[PDB]
Ligand binder design. Structure first.
Ligand SMILES: CC(C)(C)c1ccc(C(=O)Nc2ccc(CCC(=O)O)cc2)cc1
Length: 141
């Protein structure tokens, strides 16, 4: 049964100036996401993604149960965004948290377009979960 499976997640964000600062004077539009690499379907092993926005947002616990795993909002400032990626796994681990640095372009700088690549290593996953990771394009090591 000895077996290690690796899968890849990409977290990222885009930010630029709003032309029309909003009804609460929002200077930026931004978008944060979680995705797989090209030709991988992370929906096979990802139950859901939860984006924990700033406490100042309405309903700041944003849940994507299916792709795209993304939040699009307007704001005035960057903040640290907890992101939880829940797995379709019956044993441990059930999820992984990331602390995402959602930063905006200030002082009329070009738009932000950032990607953070994360490798997840699953040691001795169950038969069922191993199947999901490999279906998603996971690789045995
Ligand atoms: C500077 C600090 C405290 C980290 C921070 C950082 C960021 C923010 C921010 O942009 N909040 C916000 C911005 C837009 C909205 C949208 C409200 C709607 O849909 O009507 C709600 C809240 C607030 C505070």
């Amino acid at each position: 049964n000895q077996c290690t499976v690796q899968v890849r997640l990409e977290l990222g964000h885009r930010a630029q100036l709003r032309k029309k600062p909003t009804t609460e004077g929002f200077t930026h539009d931004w978008m944060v996401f979680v995705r797989g690499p090209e030709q991988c379907d992370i929906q096979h092993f990802v139950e859901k993604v939860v984006f924990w926005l700033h406490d100042s947002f309405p309903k700041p616990r944003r849940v994507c149960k299916e792709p795209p795993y993304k939040v699009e909002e307007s704001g005035y400032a960057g903040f640290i965004m907890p992101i939880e990626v829940h797995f379709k796994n019956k044993e441990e681990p059930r999820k992984v948290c990331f602390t995402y640095d959602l930063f905006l372009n200030l002082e009329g700088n070009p738009p932000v377009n950032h990607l953070r690549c994360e490798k997840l290593t699953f040691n001795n996953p169950t038969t069922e979960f191993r199947y999901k990771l490999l279906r998603a394009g996971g690789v045995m090591v």
